[PDB]
């Protein structure tokens, strides 16, 4: 019984039912959709009682069973970056997604017309992550067609395996076919599978000197033929492979402030043959897996679904007021923990006549503010509701808490006791995380003090509090 020392008697009852179900052969069911290993946990009556996310099956965990996670779109997301709103590229042309040129024209409305044509709907200059990936994969097909039409590159491309082909395509995106064709000796070595010799002359170039970090990852990919160079980068600001602690931390922040938008989430252990174990463990009796356990909610849908409905069919005033107060709680939760991956699909709405459930809280608590505020924005700040000033209700509930030193100290101590669970816990890195959180709390205190809006809140310069 690994879960003998839980601090929540009601939650401990849930875990007991989960273990009883496993003892009788009712195992947690792996979920097919996600980019990581998540499981619907059942009770002895085959009822879903929670969602379990093992640490080892996180997107870059060593036992993540969803191999479709490693693809060219995710490769270029790290190397080039993803933007879901129209922007201007290095050469001043309108662009969206991962470097997808919309038009050479300086007219913005021309860019939106082309964007609506490519996506297939009225986007108004904003697309979803899935739409960007579909657009990106269309660019990849075009790039491959050009490679196969190029006499210098096609024989190399045919010889390369799938992983190394992504590396070659990566170079084509960055510098074009002509630029890649200039790596004469490296291309010949790659075709001969002399990886190390190819890497030597890949590093003797303008490309390696101008963008060394991206080039080193691409060159390492050529050397190994694996995706190891893109694993556990933590987006440059997160502790790698600690999503389970971020999930549990988000509820911990929620519960202290009584936001009641994050379902109860705790760090627990579970044994189940449906988990992904290595060969050694399975032949043995399986070792428990540590991960986050979140209670199951029902009746919810992606916020993107309900937001589009409300734009064409506005809510009645009383319901709209309730939705805004729920939205404010989401804003406060995401800002304090500095969530880096809250898209308008990662939070759920049920339509208390309307309720918000905050899930997928695995990519929060960075140890530093992101260098590019445009790289990981709070995507709910692009909604019209983000410009409504914080209600007097939310300020009377939150300001007394966050303006008190003991509350902030207790919250930091609670997060310490939780985050120290991980094998890779580092005291200095944790103190960086709290300095970032205190800076977020400081800005939030000022924003509520000045009656600002969520849109104005995210514009305050980020800061750390030592
Ligand atoms: N945090 C989650 O992952 C999650 C938690 C849930 C919960 N507590 N109660 C009900 N449904 C949930 C669904 C999901 C979820 C989110 C994204 C993608 C998928 C798979 O398609 C599942």
Tab-separated table of C-alpha atoms and ligand atoms in Angstrom:
chain	number	residue	atom	x	y	z
A	1	UNK	CA	0.000	0.000	0.000
A	2	UNK	CA	2.080	2.909	-1.317
A	3	UNK	CA	-0.802	5.371	-0.753
A	4	UNK	CA	-1.057	4.815	3.014
A	5	UNK	CA	-0.086	8.405	3.910
A	6	UNK	CA	-2.464	10.573	1.885
A	7	UNK	CA	-3.729	13.773	3.510
A	8	UNK	CA	-7.287	13.545	2.106
A	9	UNK	CA	-9.601	10.861	3.555
A	10	UNK	CA	-12.106	11.327	0.720
A	11	UNK	CA	-9.331	11.014	-1.865
A	12	UNK	CA	-7.879	8.006	-0.028
A	13	UNK	CA	-11.251	6.277	-0.415
A	14	UNK	CA	-11.031	6.815	-4.185
A	15	UNK	CA	-7.546	5.293	-4.297
A	16	UNK	CA	-8.672	2.268	-2.275
A	17	UNK	CA	-11.445	1.610	-4.801
A	18	UNK	CA	-8.880	1.968	-7.590
A	19	UNK	CA	-6.572	-0.598	-5.977
A	20	UNK	CA	-9.483	-2.959	-5.299
A	21	UNK	CA	-10.476	-2.767	-8.971
A	22	UNK	CA	-6.919	-3.600	-10.045
A	23	UNK	CA	-6.759	-6.535	-7.617
A	24	UNK	CA	-9.809	-8.024	-9.381
A	25	UNK	CA	-8.535	-7.352	-12.915
A	26	UNK	CA	-10.262	-4.043	-13.730
A	27	UNK	CA	-7.194	-2.125	-14.880
A	28	UNK	CA	-6.825	1.545	-15.814
A	29	UNK	CA	-7.567	2.054	-19.501
A	30	UNK	CA	-4.974	3.787	-21.669
A	31	UNK	CA	-6.255	6.841	-23.536
A	32	UNK	CA	-5.499	6.819	-27.260
A	33	UNK	CA	-5.735	10.520	-28.136
A	34	UNK	CA	-3.032	12.270	-26.134
A	35	UNK	CA	0.666	12.785	-26.786
A	36	UNK	CA	1.506	10.957	-23.538
A	37	UNK	CA	0.387	8.062	-21.370
A	38	UNK	CA	-2.830	8.877	-19.510
A	39	UNK	CA	-5.269	6.346	-18.088
A	40	UNK	CA	-8.930	6.252	-17.093
A	41	UNK	CA	-8.910	4.596	-13.669
A	42	UNK	CA	-11.875	2.367	-12.829
A	43	UNK	CA	-13.559	1.254	-9.612
A	44	UNK	CA	-14.687	-2.358	-8.999
A	45	UNK	CA	-17.975	-1.408	-10.718
A	46	UNK	CA	-16.061	-0.363	-13.887
A	47	UNK	CA	-16.903	3.314	-13.285
A	48	UNK	CA	-14.330	5.948	-14.222
A	49	UNK	CA	-13.111	7.592	-11.012
A	50	UNK	CA	-10.038	9.491	-12.203
A	51	UNK	CA	-7.321	10.208	-14.743
A	52	UNK	CA	-3.815	8.916	-13.987
A	53	UNK	CA	-0.671	10.308	-15.640
A	54	UNK	CA	2.503	8.373	-14.757
A	55	UNK	CA	5.735	10.341	-14.547
A	56	UNK	CA	7.544	7.863	-16.814
A	57	UNK	CA	4.857	8.151	-19.532
A	58	UNK	CA	4.891	11.967	-19.762
A	59	UNK	CA	5.492	13.412	-23.268
A	60	UNK	CA	9.276	13.014	-22.937
A	61	UNK	CA	9.301	10.264	-20.326
A	62	UNK	CA	11.318	7.153	-21.081
A	63	UNK	CA	8.161	4.988	-21.189
A	64	UNK	CA	5.749	7.228	-23.119
A	65	UNK	CA	3.809	4.819	-25.388
A	66	UNK	CA	2.621	7.465	-27.892
A	67	UNK	CA	5.400	7.411	-30.482
A	68	UNK	CA	3.497	9.827	-32.746
A	69	UNK	CA	4.682	12.548	-30.354
A	70	UNK	CA	8.084	12.532	-32.091
A	71	UNK	CA	7.460	14.018	-35.543
A	72	UNK	CA	8.643	16.855	-37.776
A	73	UNK	CA	5.988	19.281	-36.493
A	74	UNK	CA	7.235	18.948	-32.911
A	75	UNK	CA	10.829	19.140	-34.159
A	76	UNK	CA	10.246	22.494	-35.863
A	77	UNK	CA	8.090	23.683	-32.955
A	78	UNK	CA	11.211	23.515	-30.779
A	79	UNK	CA	13.652	24.781	-33.411
A	80	UNK	CA	11.498	27.473	-35.050
A	81	UNK	CA	8.518	28.082	-32.773
A	82	UNK	CA	4.734	28.016	-33.102
A	83	UNK	CA	2.500	31.092	-33.320
A	84	UNK	CA	-1.290	30.834	-33.547
A	85	UNK	CA	-1.814	34.480	-34.573
A	86	UNK	CA	-0.726	36.319	-37.712
A	87	UNK	CA	2.683	37.973	-37.383
A	88	UNK	CA	5.442	39.431	-39.566
A	89	UNK	CA	8.501	37.310	-40.348
A	90	UNK	CA	12.178	38.283	-40.387
A	91	UNK	CA	11.717	39.784	-43.867
A	92	UNK	CA	8.521	41.666	-42.988
A	93	UNK	CA	5.954	39.369	-44.634
A	94	UNK	CA	2.789	38.128	-42.940
A	95	UNK	CA	3.133	34.659	-41.429
A	96	UNK	CA	1.268	32.219	-39.171
A	97	UNK	CA	1.929	28.813	-37.646
A	98	UNK	CA	5.501	27.579	-38.028
A	99	UNK	CA	6.898	29.963	-40.626
A	100	UNK	CA	3.971	29.530	-43.032
A	101	UNK	CA	4.031	32.552	-45.327
A	102	UNK	CA	0.513	33.837	-46.025
A	103	UNK	CA	1.243	36.556	-48.606
A	104	UNK	CA	4.024	38.856	-49.784
A	105	UNK	CA	1.517	41.723	-49.868
A	106	UNK	CA	1.682	44.393	-47.132
A	107	UNK	CA	-2.127	44.301	-46.828
A	108	UNK	CA	-3.335	42.603	-43.650
A	109	UNK	CA	-6.768	41.762	-45.081
A	110	UNK	CA	-5.037	39.907	-47.919
A	111	UNK	CA	-3.268	37.747	-45.330
A	112	UNK	CA	-6.551	36.916	-43.588
A	113	UNK	CA	-8.177	35.991	-46.910
A	114	UNK	CA	-5.354	33.574	-47.736
A	115	UNK	CA	-5.433	32.236	-44.172
A	116	UNK	CA	-9.182	31.602	-44.373
A	117	UNK	CA	-8.602	29.801	-47.678
A	118	UNK	CA	-5.866	27.543	-46.292
A	119	UNK	CA	-7.561	26.739	-42.978
A	120	UNK	CA	-11.021	26.420	-44.515
A	121	UNK	CA	-13.037	28.674	-42.186
A	122	UNK	CA	-13.366	32.262	-40.955
A	123	UNK	CA	-10.370	32.466	-38.620
A	124	UNK	CA	-10.082	36.261	-38.177
A	125	UNK	CA	-6.308	35.790	-38.032
A	126	UNK	CA	-6.241	33.207	-35.211
A	127	UNK	CA	-5.975	29.431	-35.664
A	128	UNK	CA	-5.754	26.394	-33.399
A	129	UNK	CA	-2.719	24.212	-32.735
A	130	UNK	CA	-4.224	21.354	-34.757
A	131	UNK	CA	-4.898	23.691	-37.689
A	132	UNK	CA	-1.276	24.865	-37.600
A	133	UNK	CA	-0.055	21.255	-37.652
A	134	UNK	CA	-2.217	20.457	-40.682
A	135	UNK	CA	-0.891	23.592	-42.375
A	136	UNK	CA	2.670	22.623	-41.422
A	137	UNK	CA	2.306	19.088	-42.798
A	138	UNK	CA	1.166	20.601	-46.097
A	139	UNK	CA	4.394	22.621	-46.141
A	140	UNK	CA	6.384	19.448	-45.401
A	141	UNK	CA	4.832	17.676	-48.391
A	142	UNK	CA	5.760	20.644	-50.588
A	143	UNK	CA	9.320	20.624	-49.230
A	144	UNK	CA	9.677	16.877	-49.853
A	145	UNK	CA	8.418	17.272	-53.425
A	146	UNK	CA	11.077	19.911	-54.046
A	147	UNK	CA	13.760	17.709	-52.482
A	148	UNK	CA	12.813	14.797	-54.744
A	149	UNK	CA	13.005	17.135	-57.755
A	150	UNK	CA	16.534	18.246	-56.750
A	151	UNK	CA	19.297	16.129	-58.280
A	152	UNK	CA	21.797	16.794	-55.484
A	153	UNK	CA	19.404	16.096	-52.587
A	154	UNK	CA	17.138	13.284	-53.832
A	155	UNK	CA	19.715	10.431	-53.670
A	156	UNK	CA	20.608	11.460	-50.109
A	157	UNK	CA	16.942	11.711	-49.087
A	158	UNK	CA	16.103	8.264	-50.486
A	159	UNK	CA	18.965	6.698	-48.522
A	160	UNK	CA	18.025	8.317	-45.202
A	161	UNK	CA	15.833	6.711	-42.561
A	162	UNK	CA	12.692	8.423	-41.277
A	163	UNK	CA	14.310	10.242	-38.345
A	164	UNK	CA	17.286	11.493	-40.349
A	165	UNK	CA	14.954	12.601	-43.149
A	166	UNK	CA	13.326	14.985	-40.669
A	167	UNK	CA	16.777	16.418	-39.948
A	168	UNK	CA	17.397	16.963	-43.668
A	169	UNK	CA	13.954	18.547	-44.092
A	170	UNK	CA	14.716	20.748	-41.066
A	171	UNK	CA	17.783	22.118	-42.854
A	172	UNK	CA	15.754	22.747	-46.024
A	173	UNK	CA	13.174	24.781	-44.092
A	174	UNK	CA	15.862	26.951	-42.487
A	175	UNK	CA	18.214	27.574	-45.423
A	176	UNK	CA	16.487	26.279	-48.570
A	177	UNK	CA	17.490	23.592	-51.042
A	178	UNK	CA	20.443	25.576	-52.389
A	179	UNK	CA	21.884	26.093	-48.907
A	180	UNK	CA	21.616	22.403	-48.033
A	181	UNK	CA	23.143	21.492	-51.402
A	182	UNK	CA	26.295	23.386	-50.394
A	183	UNK	CA	27.159	20.774	-47.744
A	184	UNK	CA	28.790	18.705	-50.464
A	185	UNK	CA	30.950	16.328	-48.417
A	186	UNK	CA	28.382	15.931	-45.626
A	187	UNK	CA	25.681	14.911	-48.107
A	188	UNK	CA	27.971	12.251	-49.581
A	189	UNK	CA	28.879	10.980	-46.105
A	190	UNK	CA	25.206	10.856	-45.093
A	191	UNK	CA	24.410	8.805	-48.198
A	192	UNK	CA	27.226	6.433	-47.167
A	193	UNK	CA	25.903	6.369	-43.561
A	194	UNK	CA	29.225	7.782	-42.307
A	195	UNK	CA	27.443	9.864	-39.693
A	196	UNK	CA	30.389	11.183	-37.665
A	197	UNK	CA	32.295	12.266	-40.782
A	198	UNK	CA	29.157	14.025	-42.032
A	199	UNK	CA	28.809	15.810	-38.684
A	200	UNK	CA	32.364	17.183	-38.903
A	201	UNK	CA	31.666	19.181	-42.066
A	202	UNK	CA	28.149	20.093	-40.954
A	203	UNK	CA	29.751	21.972	-38.042
A	204	UNK	CA	32.154	23.843	-40.369
A	205	UNK	CA	29.605	26.252	-41.814
A	206	UNK	CA	27.848	29.581	-41.429
A	207	UNK	CA	24.795	27.591	-40.316
A	208	UNK	CA	26.603	26.119	-37.311
A	209	UNK	CA	28.094	29.487	-36.361
A	210	UNK	CA	24.900	31.543	-36.755
A	211	UNK	CA	22.399	29.169	-35.075
A	212	UNK	CA	24.590	26.782	-33.046
A	213	UNK	CA	21.864	25.456	-30.734
A	214	UNK	CA	19.506	24.420	-33.538
A	215	UNK	CA	22.375	23.149	-35.690
A	216	UNK	CA	23.796	21.016	-32.873
A	217	UNK	CA	20.422	19.319	-32.371
A	218	UNK	CA	20.095	18.669	-36.116
A	219	UNK	CA	23.684	17.416	-36.400
A	220	UNK	CA	23.255	15.170	-33.347
A	221	UNK	CA	20.101	13.767	-34.966
A	222	UNK	CA	22.178	12.842	-38.025
A	223	UNK	CA	24.753	11.149	-35.775
A	224	UNK	CA	22.342	9.033	-33.711
A	225	UNK	CA	19.236	8.664	-35.858
A	226	UNK	CA	17.108	9.227	-32.735
A	227	UNK	CA	15.120	12.098	-31.216
A	228	UNK	CA	17.264	12.259	-28.056
A	229	UNK	CA	18.507	15.758	-28.926
A	230	UNK	CA	14.950	17.124	-28.564
A	231	UNK	CA	14.047	15.359	-25.296
A	232	UNK	CA	13.763	17.036	-21.886
A	233	UNK	CA	14.450	20.570	-23.085
A	234	UNK	CA	11.646	21.761	-20.788
A	235	UNK	CA	10.728	24.507	-23.295
A	236	UNK	CA	13.790	26.334	-21.962
A	237	UNK	CA	12.008	27.271	-18.724
A	238	UNK	CA	10.507	24.112	-17.151
A	239	UNK	CA	12.054	21.337	-15.103
A	240	UNK	CA	11.997	18.300	-17.425
A	241	UNK	CA	9.655	15.375	-16.785
A	242	UNK	CA	7.888	16.845	-13.746
A	243	UNK	CA	4.406	17.253	-15.181
A	244	UNK	CA	2.899	15.122	-12.417
A	245	UNK	CA	4.125	17.606	-9.807
A	246	UNK	CA	2.847	20.518	-11.904
A	247	UNK	CA	-0.579	18.844	-12.103
A	248	UNK	CA	-0.661	18.358	-8.329
A	249	UNK	CA	0.736	21.843	-7.726
A	250	UNK	CA	-2.029	23.489	-9.751
A	251	UNK	CA	-4.712	21.966	-7.526
A	252	UNK	CA	-2.676	22.928	-4.449
A	253	UNK	CA	-2.709	26.577	-5.544
A	254	UNK	CA	-6.407	26.260	-6.435
A	255	UNK	CA	-7.344	24.811	-3.045
A	256	UNK	CA	-5.501	27.483	-1.050
A	257	UNK	CA	-7.372	30.252	-2.896
A	258	UNK	CA	-10.631	28.233	-3.112
A	259	UNK	CA	-10.806	28.697	-6.882
A	260	UNK	CA	-12.559	25.301	-7.273
A	261	UNK	CA	-11.760	24.973	-10.982
A	262	UNK	CA	-9.088	22.244	-10.715
A	263	UNK	CA	-10.465	18.809	-9.755
A	264	UNK	CA	-8.683	17.184	-6.823
A	265	UNK	CA	-5.244	16.118	-8.033
A	266	UNK	CA	-2.714	14.249	-5.903
A	267	UNK	CA	0.555	12.398	-6.392
A	268	UNK	CA	-0.152	8.667	-5.959
A	269	UNK	CA	1.300	5.289	-6.914
A	270	UNK	CA	-0.415	2.589	-8.969
A	271	UNK	CA	0.425	-0.878	-10.299
A	272	UNK	CA	-1.233	-1.986	-13.535
A	273	UNK	CA	-0.206	-4.283	-16.376
A	274	UNK	CA	-1.788	-1.803	-18.807
A	275	UNK	CA	1.018	0.650	-18.015
A	276	UNK	CA	4.129	0.632	-20.195
A	277	UNK	CA	6.869	-1.250	-18.340
A	278	UNK	CA	10.295	-2.226	-19.613
A	279	UNK	CA	11.098	-5.858	-20.382
A	280	UNK	CA	12.819	-6.521	-17.039
A	281	UNK	CA	9.925	-5.374	-14.841
A	282	UNK	CA	7.240	-7.259	-16.772
A	283	UNK	CA	9.039	-10.609	-16.479
A	284	UNK	CA	8.949	-10.070	-12.697
A	285	UNK	CA	5.147	-8.205	-9.128
A	286	UNK	CA	5.241	-5.069	-11.262
A	287	UNK	CA	6.859	-1.994	-9.674
A	288	UNK	CA	4.463	0.849	-8.851
A	289	UNK	CA	4.404	3.932	-11.062
A	290	UNK	CA	4.286	7.411	-9.551
A	291	UNK	CA	2.073	9.991	-11.222
A	292	UNK	CA	-0.768	12.457	-10.892
A	293	UNK	CA	-4.315	11.280	-10.151
A	294	UNK	CA	-7.110	13.717	-11.023
A	295	UNK	CA	-10.784	13.156	-10.234
A	296	UNK	CA	-13.082	12.587	-13.203
A	297	UNK	CA	-15.514	15.307	-14.293
A	298	UNK	CA	-18.479	14.916	-16.639
A	299	UNK	CA	-20.431	16.983	-19.144
A	300	UNK	CA	-17.567	19.248	-20.225
A	301	UNK	CA	-16.274	20.222	-23.654
A	302	UNK	CA	-13.310	22.150	-25.004
A	303	UNK	CA	-13.646	25.875	-24.364
A	304	UNK	CA	-13.070	26.473	-28.082
A	305	UNK	CA	-16.369	24.682	-28.726
A	306	UNK	CA	-18.406	26.863	-26.356
A	307	UNK	CA	-16.569	30.120	-27.118
A	308	UNK	CA	-17.489	29.916	-30.810
A	309	UNK	CA	-21.108	29.184	-29.872
A	310	UNK	CA	-21.278	32.221	-27.584
A	311	UNK	CA	-19.833	34.510	-30.261
A	312	UNK	CA	-22.686	33.692	-32.653
A	313	UNK	CA	-25.203	33.201	-29.805
A	314	UNK	CA	-24.317	35.460	-26.859
A	315	UNK	CA	-25.125	34.173	-23.401
A	316	UNK	CA	-27.887	35.744	-21.299
A	317	UNK	CA	-26.567	38.389	-18.935
A	318	UNK	CA	-26.922	36.339	-15.745
A	319	UNK	CA	-25.113	33.358	-17.294
A	320	UNK	CA	-22.492	35.613	-18.858
A	321	UNK	CA	-21.744	37.033	-15.406
A	322	UNK	CA	-21.273	33.519	-14.021
A	323	UNK	CA	-18.999	32.576	-16.924
A	324	UNK	CA	-16.841	35.671	-16.424
A	325	UNK	CA	-16.317	34.916	-12.727
A	326	UNK	CA	-15.293	31.376	-13.671
A	327	UNK	CA	-13.001	32.838	-16.342
A	328	UNK	CA	-11.403	35.139	-13.757
A	329	UNK	CA	-10.569	32.137	-11.570
A	330	UNK	CA	-8.870	30.496	-14.556
A	331	UNK	CA	-6.847	33.668	-15.190
A	332	UNK	CA	-5.666	33.856	-11.577
A	333	UNK	CA	-4.742	30.170	-11.481
A	334	UNK	CA	-2.754	30.286	-14.727
A	335	UNK	CA	-0.983	33.543	-13.884
A	336	UNK	CA	0.209	32.537	-10.404
A	337	UNK	CA	1.624	29.207	-11.617
A	338	UNK	CA	2.728	30.746	-14.951
A	339	UNK	CA	1.090	28.094	-17.102
A	340	UNK	CA	2.982	27.894	-20.386
A	341	UNK	CA	0.528	25.709	-22.325
A	342	UNK	CA	-3.013	26.934	-21.653
A	343	UNK	CA	-4.647	26.933	-25.064
A	344	UNK	CA	-8.320	27.566	-25.588
A	345	UNK	CA	-8.635	23.776	-25.873
A	346	UNK	CA	-6.775	22.892	-22.650
A	347	UNK	CA	-9.545	24.307	-20.436
A	348	UNK	CA	-13.074	22.920	-20.391
A	349	UNK	CA	-16.540	24.474	-20.102
A	350	UNK	CA	-19.788	22.783	-19.057
A	351	UNK	CA	-23.075	24.376	-20.108
A	352	UNK	CA	-23.786	26.579	-11.311
A	353	UNK	CA	-25.435	26.998	-14.703
A	354	UNK	CA	-21.975	27.208	-16.328
A	355	UNK	CA	-18.707	25.789	-14.981
A	356	UNK	CA	-15.019	25.804	-15.926
A	357	UNK	CA	-12.753	22.823	-15.248
A	358	UNK	CA	-9.000	23.395	-15.488
A	359	UNK	CA	-7.219	20.235	-16.641
A	360	UNK	CA	-3.902	19.402	-18.346
A	361	UNK	CA	-1.976	21.393	-15.736
A	362	UNK	CA	1.347	19.701	-16.448
A	363	UNK	CA	3.403	22.484	-18.005
A	364	UNK	CA	3.441	25.121	-15.256
A	365	UNK	CA	5.768	26.375	-12.493
A	366	UNK	CA	8.745	27.434	-14.653
A	367	UNK	CA	12.037	28.222	-12.961
A	368	UNK	CA	12.376	31.343	-15.138
A	369	UNK	CA	10.172	33.650	-17.144
A	370	UNK	CA	10.237	32.673	-20.840
A	371	UNK	CA	12.634	34.749	-22.916
A	372	UNK	CA	9.986	35.113	-25.641
A	373	UNK	CA	6.678	36.210	-24.137
A	374	UNK	CA	5.224	35.533	-27.600
A	375	UNK	CA	6.448	31.922	-27.507
A	376	UNK	CA	4.217	30.818	-24.595
A	377	UNK	CA	1.424	33.387	-24.192
A	378	UNK	CA	-1.735	33.004	-22.141
A	379	UNK	CA	-4.043	32.213	-25.045
A	380	UNK	CA	-7.143	33.244	-23.097
A	381	UNK	CA	-5.755	36.797	-23.209
A	382	UNK	CA	-6.681	36.958	-26.909
A	383	UNK	CA	-10.377	36.526	-26.091
A	384	UNK	CA	-12.650	39.589	-25.808
A	385	UNK	CA	-13.591	38.595	-22.244
A	386	UNK	CA	-9.979	39.154	-21.165
A	387	UNK	CA	-10.533	42.925	-21.429
A	388	UNK	CA	-13.326	42.950	-18.821
A	389	UNK	CA	-11.884	44.354	-15.561
A	390	UNK	CA	-11.629	41.961	-12.631
A	391	UNK	CA	-14.925	41.900	-10.761
A	392	UNK	CA	-15.166	43.294	-7.249
A	393	UNK	CA	-16.063	39.742	-6.198
A	394	UNK	CA	-12.776	38.162	-7.310
A	395	UNK	CA	-10.722	40.940	-5.689
A	396	UNK	CA	-12.339	40.510	-2.262
A	397	UNK	CA	-11.630	36.760	-2.439
A	398	UNK	CA	-8.014	36.820	-3.680
A	399	UNK	CA	-6.429	40.083	-2.512
A	400	UNK	CA	-6.735	39.274	1.239
A	401	UNK	CA	-4.905	35.987	0.611
A	402	UNK	CA	-2.081	36.974	-1.737
A	403	UNK	CA	-1.386	40.257	0.089
A	404	UNK	CA	-0.595	38.363	3.324
A	405	UNK	CA	2.991	37.217	3.857
A	406	UNK	CA	2.050	34.102	5.836
A	407	UNK	CA	-0.244	32.884	3.048
A	408	UNK	CA	2.517	33.320	0.457
A	409	UNK	CA	5.093	31.687	2.743
A	410	UNK	CA	2.740	28.779	3.477
A	411	UNK	CA	2.042	28.303	-0.240
A	412	UNK	CA	5.775	28.184	-0.987
A	413	UNK	CA	6.314	25.687	1.840
A	414	UNK	CA	3.445	23.509	0.585
A	415	UNK	CA	4.893	23.491	-2.933
A	416	UNK	CA	8.311	22.622	-1.492
A	417	UNK	CA	6.924	19.617	0.378
A	418	UNK	CA	5.271	18.474	-2.855
A	419	UNK	CA	8.084	19.216	-5.322
A	420	UNK	CA	10.746	17.524	-3.171
A	421	UNK	CA	9.189	14.173	-4.146
A	422	UNK	CA	10.953	14.049	-7.518
A	423	UNK	CA	14.338	12.349	-7.802
A	424	UNK	CA	15.720	15.345	-9.691
A	425	UNK	CA	14.682	17.925	-7.101
A	426	UNK	CA	17.200	20.771	-6.825
A	427	UNK	CA	17.010	23.327	-4.020
A	428	UNK	CA	18.404	26.237	-6.038
A	429	UNK	CA	16.112	25.485	-8.989
A	430	UNK	CA	13.094	25.328	-6.678
A	431	UNK	CA	13.956	28.747	-5.239
A	432	UNK	CA	14.014	30.070	-8.804
A	433	UNK	CA	10.497	28.667	-9.266
A	434	UNK	CA	9.209	30.448	-6.159
A	435	UNK	CA	10.872	33.733	-7.124
A	436	UNK	CA	8.963	33.546	-10.419
A	437	UNK	CA	5.703	32.730	-8.621
A	438	UNK	CA	6.163	35.600	-6.164
A	439	UNK	CA	6.692	37.933	-9.111
A	440	UNK	CA	3.444	36.683	-10.632
A	441	UNK	CA	1.712	37.147	-7.267
A	442	UNK	CA	3.168	40.658	-7.003
A	443	UNK	CA	1.853	41.673	-10.437
A	444	UNK	CA	-1.517	40.063	-9.713
A	445	UNK	CA	-1.753	42.011	-6.450
A	446	UNK	CA	-1.070	45.261	-8.313
A	447	UNK	CA	-3.519	44.363	-11.091
A	448	UNK	CA	-6.325	43.633	-8.625
A	449	UNK	CA	-5.305	46.729	-6.648
A	450	UNK	CA	-5.625	48.927	-9.753
A	451	UNK	CA	-8.792	47.236	-11.023
A	452	UNK	CA	-7.098	46.056	-14.213
A	453	UNK	CA	-8.359	43.331	-16.558
A	454	UNK	CA	-6.852	39.949	-17.501
A	455	UNK	CA	-5.746	41.529	-20.784
A	456	UNK	CA	-3.962	44.280	-18.857
A	457	UNK	CA	-2.594	41.803	-16.298
A	458	UNK	CA	-0.560	39.866	-18.876
A	459	UNK	CA	0.963	43.113	-20.189
A	460	UNK	CA	2.664	43.972	-16.882
A	461	UNK	CA	6.399	43.219	-17.267
A	462	UNK	CA	7.401	39.913	-15.729
A	463	UNK	CA	9.606	40.063	-12.641
A	464	UNK	CA	11.129	37.806	-9.996
A	465	UNK	CA	11.062	38.470	-6.253
A	466	UNK	CA	14.194	37.398	-4.383
B	1	LIG	N1	-6.382	16.233	-17.512
B	1	LIG	C1	-6.783	15.418	-18.482
B	1	LIG	O1	-5.998	14.906	-19.288
B	1	LIG	C2	-8.247	15.106	-18.554
B	1	LIG	C3	-8.896	15.096	-17.343
B	1	LIG	C4	-10.273	14.788	-17.259
B	1	LIG	C5	-11.049	14.752	-16.046
B	1	LIG	N2	-10.502	15.044	-14.856
B	1	LIG	N3	-12.347	14.438	-16.078
B	1	LIG	C6	-12.887	14.169	-17.268
B	1	LIG	N4	-12.306	14.167	-18.458
B	1	LIG	C7	-10.965	14.486	-18.445
B	1	LIG	C8	-10.282	14.509	-19.682
B	1	LIG	C9	-8.940	14.822	-19.751
B	1	LIG	C10	-8.297	14.870	-21.093
B	1	LIG	C11	-7.742	16.051	-21.585
B	1	LIG	C12	-7.181	16.092	-22.851
B	1	LIG	C13	-7.168	14.958	-23.643
B	1	LIG	C14	-7.713	13.767	-23.185
B	1	LIG	C15	-7.741	12.542	-24.061
B	1	LIG	O2	-8.434	12.769	-25.276
B	1	LIG	C16	-8.266	13.737	-21.908
